[PDB]
Amino acid sequence: PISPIETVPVKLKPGMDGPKVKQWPLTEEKIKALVEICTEMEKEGKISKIGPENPYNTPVFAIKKKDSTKWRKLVDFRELNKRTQDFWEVQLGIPHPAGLKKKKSVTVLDVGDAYFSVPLDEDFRKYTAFTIPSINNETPGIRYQYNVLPQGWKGSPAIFQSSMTKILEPFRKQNPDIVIYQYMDDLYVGSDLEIGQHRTKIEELRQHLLRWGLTTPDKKHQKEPPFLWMGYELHPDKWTVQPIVLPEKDSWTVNDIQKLVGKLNWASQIYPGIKVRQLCKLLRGTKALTEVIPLTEEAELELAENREILKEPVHGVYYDPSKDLIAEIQKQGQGQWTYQIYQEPFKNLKTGKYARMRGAHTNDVKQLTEAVQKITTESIVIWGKTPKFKLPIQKETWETWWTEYWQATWIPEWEFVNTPPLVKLWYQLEKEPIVGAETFYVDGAANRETKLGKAGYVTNRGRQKVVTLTDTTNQKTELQAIYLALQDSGLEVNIVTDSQYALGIIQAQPDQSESELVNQIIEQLIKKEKVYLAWVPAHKGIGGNEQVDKLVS
Amino acid sequence: IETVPVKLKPGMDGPKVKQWPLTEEKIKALVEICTEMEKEGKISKIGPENPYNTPVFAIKKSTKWRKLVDFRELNKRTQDFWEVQLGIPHPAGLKKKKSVTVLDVGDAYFSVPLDEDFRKYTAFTIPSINNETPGIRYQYNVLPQGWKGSPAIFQSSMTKILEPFRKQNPDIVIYQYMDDLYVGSDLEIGQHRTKIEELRQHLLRWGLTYELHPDKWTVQPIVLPEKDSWTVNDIQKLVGKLNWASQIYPGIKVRQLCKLLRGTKALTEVIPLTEEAELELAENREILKEPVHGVYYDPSKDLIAEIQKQGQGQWTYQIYQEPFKNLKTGKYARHTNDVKQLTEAVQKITTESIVIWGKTPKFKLPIQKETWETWWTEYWQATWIPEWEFVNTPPLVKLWYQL
Ligand SMILES: CCn1c(C(=O)c2cc(C)cc(C#N)c2)c(C(C)C)c(=O)[nH]c1=O
């Protein structure tokens, strides 16, 4: 049928006019097939015969469907689409299984001929004109225009969805007890009535859909659980991802490793503790998909650890709105984090992974807070409320951090949980200068064109030491000078620098870095008893700064 | 009533800012609110043929949820209309007043119809949890709150409403900014408050149902300690701070002081102060107390604001148009909640900014984008929203503005 629902007014982009492409001449079998299709469509109202004056045209083609002897009408809307107005996004975000409430009864209803079942703005139809060419194009062709939403036109998915929304609206007002998800040309319907009163509410729905143009499957043609949907397996009171098979291979190609990582990432939605750091490392660099990459030993270990987790099947449960959400996070290692969200321990709604580095240098407290933040956003999306957290960090460790760090922060309600490795601070710079501790006035300096560098220091006990660095930046030398003062000093040491850059880095208490130097400074700062770091203005003739500044050049 | 044609700035198109995820309780509050405004004909449900979108949020003022539409983009895109075509003049006498009361007159706007051809640009979306349904989409049929066009358009009705009250109190300064009325006088506080009630009654006959003290507003000068014995470290921190000042305040001198830091000395060492250093130090403290020489407000330029977290519930801020040329610097203090405080400091700063310049600053915020994105709404009470970005504070700057 074609829905009686009022049409959505459509227009072209303001500067523009509708397409006027020329019809490519087509073979005889194709012209035949197109005529057969169009005549059938025309008799259902889908399209109408026109003749010029209508100036517009969009090319039509016919393809031979798979191996079968069926033909299909393909229309190339490229130009009309470029000239058609933008619409609002159809649906931004898709439901996650973990967010569904458990239902006593669920039914899937797919709309038949969804697009062709919805009218097109009368005033817009004329821009959809296409022409079936005569044999070798010797005579005038047969011209139609759409009365309904064309396949492949820009506005179709959006106008359809809004039509379904308007049509569904009343049944929703009258049936709050009933849940309906709109996805594409599907309806998913659930309630907590017993079979009978549900089977009954369905038919009402269907019948309402029918008054409105939309045909739907009958009791006998409704699919049964488990439903497979967008990569998931949806059972009556649980869900999981669709079955994942890690390929056995002697030799892995880029393409194979990419697909493997994608499957792992997908699996990590509900399989706890999936990791892909060591695999992703392989993907770094620039190669073709066809290239074989030898698995490193750590990647080989990783695939193995994943292989075992995937061994026995896991599932997630659905959301009970009357209980709180709890989220647990664990450190999995080098910048890697995993989490689980449950309501009853330890039956997970879902699980997940966090890796991203924010900057070149951070520490676990920063990283853990980034993961709390990422999990909070996701939980608001899926459930509409923030979880209660259980974190591998003492409350006192976290408050020491927050109070003395310069960036503001605030994680929602959380508790300590003793699930090592725990996140801790690995050193703390002194807050005051250390009496009886040797003061190193350090400095670095590189020549811009040469790339030659020289890092040194001077102390108040008269020590001095300069070293040369090759192919170094004006700011690498400033870190070297600090590393230098760290390894020649005692367990207590004050260091004076004029590098805000170096100061900024160290003052944030990094415990990991992309930089080898910074990784070395860190190992040092941990070995120490007390380090106090101070900053001075360069070239102001201040104290020992003048001296070590002279030594480097 | 006859509507006012509204033109976007030529070329550029309307807003298409995505909606942020909202919690269930805020969504529900928004549905109620919007179902009611639709009954009252202020908004209407819209189709997919409307490409545009601006964000909406719910704030809690009172224990009544309120709707806050984020028109930052639209305003930026309509700026020719509300600023150059129908600009509202900012009184310089406002900031001189003993007391300023801020009144919300946003209800005024719901009675004036919005230009038919402009309505599509006010589109917004109420989201749904887990994307169960498509958003609920509306646009405005009347002057929306949050849009800088609404006061621009409504102003001449505002002038009529206020004309008697102005005539009768010629020394009272009234300034409209967005959804707000700013009312300043020099009266004693009881009389000032009496005058505000009198004003409310005027407003009340036209369907329009806290105290600032701008005098009390004074610099947060960069403060040079007054110390007992000075260490090398202490003088080093003093030079660094004065070296910062010298980018800003003409006349700052450092020679006499750093003469003290001679050789390669231990940081903890106590070094006595020169006759000259102490004079220099004194002459510099004079300079920091006063306003910056050479820095002036350019009305064509944007205002910027930086905030440093000082710890212990203290927060410093500076306002400028070009970096380091400070028009104002200040302090806000006193939650063990960093985001709650930061939120307070931004609203306070914005408010002072509106009183002084008639402009909202763009903020440089010392916080991770996503954290702020998730939480600012829990504590926000203002009806406008400044522009902001997110910054890592240089550890130096924070130290130079400490107290
Ligand atoms: C059984 C899974 N389920 C479902 C559901 O059956 C469903 C859900 C989606 C998103 C897609 C598909 C398909 N194909 C099916 C719903 C429905 C009524 C939303 C619900 O409420 N609660 C729920 O546990």
Curated annotation (Swiss-Prot), chain A:
Changing E89G: Confers resistance to pyrophosphate analog PFA. Error-prone enzyme that lacks a proof-reading function. High mutations rate is a direct consequence of this characteristic. RT also displays frequent template switching leading to high recombination rate. Recombination mostly occurs between homologous regions of the two copackaged RNA genomes. If these two RNA molecules derive from different viral strains, reverse transcription will give rise to highly recombinated proviral DNAs. Mg(2+) 2 binds at D443, E478, D498, D549. Changing L234A: Complete loss of RT dimerization. The record marks F440, Y441 as: Cleavage. Changing G190T: Confers resistance to efavirenz, HBY 097 and nevirapine. Changing K101P: Confers resistance to TMC125. Changing P236L: Confers resistance to atevirdine and delavirdine. Changing L92I: Confers resistance to pyrophosphate analog PFA. It is found in: Virion. The chain holds residues 588 to 1140 of 1435 of the full protein. This is Reverse transcriptase/ribonuclease H. Changing L100I: Confers resistance to nevirapine and efavirenz. RT is structured in five subdomains: finger, palm, thumb, connection and RNase H. Within the palm subdomain, the 'primer grip' region is thought to be involved in the positioning of the primer terminus for accommodating the incoming nucleotide. The RNase H domain stabilizes the association of RT with primer-template. Mg(2+) 1 binds at D110, D185, D186.
